[PDB]
Amino acid sequence: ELRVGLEESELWLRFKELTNEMIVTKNGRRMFPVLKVNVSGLDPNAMYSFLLDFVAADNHRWKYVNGEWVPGGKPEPQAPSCVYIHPDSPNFGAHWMKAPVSFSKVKLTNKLNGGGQIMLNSLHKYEPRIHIVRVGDPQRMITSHCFPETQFIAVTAYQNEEITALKIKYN
Numbered sequence: 061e062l063r064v065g066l067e068e069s070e071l072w073l074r075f076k077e078l079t080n081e082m083i084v085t086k087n088g089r090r091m092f093p094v095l096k097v098n099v100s101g102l103d104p105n106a107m108y109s110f111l112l113d114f115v116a117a118d119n120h121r122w123k124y125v126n127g128e129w130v131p132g133g134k135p136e137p138q139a140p141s142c143v144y145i146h147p148d149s150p151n152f153g154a155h156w157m158k159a160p161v162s163f164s165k166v167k168l169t170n171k172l173n174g175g176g177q178i179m180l181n182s183l184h185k186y187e188p189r190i191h192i193v194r195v196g197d198p199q200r201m202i203t204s205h206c207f208p209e210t211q212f213i214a215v216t217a218y219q220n221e222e223i224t225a226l227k228i229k230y231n
């Protein structure tokens with residue numbers, strides 16, 4: 061059976077407890093924690109690409125008021141569909157399964173200024189999603205996994221001082 065497991069799930073849960081925030085900038089900002097997954101049940105002999113995108117969680121935006129995240133108004137129109145290709149792509153099943161797959165280099169941005177960055181709307185909540193794409197497949201088989209522990213609100217600046225502190229503590 062294909063199994064894609066979240067690495068460092070208890071680290072993600074420490075952030076999710078506070079409501080996780082990721083900074084978006086013009087030139088793009090790397091995530092902490094980094095999304096890392098373990099993989100079993102691929103064909104070790106087959107070739108696959110790993111893709112990452114971010115799914116909008118809500119039909120509204122958020123705002124931080126009196127130390128609480130609350131519904132913050134109607135959403136901005138959906139960010140353009142940005143997909144990040146894991147740089148090891150394409151590679152053998154054996155490659156993806158021998159050690160956790162790390163998306164350490166993906167950058168989150170609030171400006172369409174290229175560089176393979178992911179555009180997100182500030183004060184909107186997103187859920188990372190990984191796609192495994194089989195190479196040379198006439199059926200173009202794709203598998204998609206979502207990671208609920210990794211949900212975060214995109215921000216231009218940290219709202220929760222506990223997130224500011226946690227980001228310093230664990231990074």
Ligand SMILES: C[C@@H](CO)Nc1ncc(Cl)cc1F
Nearest residue numbers: 067068069070071072074230
């Ligand atoms: C939070 C802590 C709980 O034992 N777990 C982790 N902490 C930090 C790193 Cl670098 C990775 C982890 F997996």
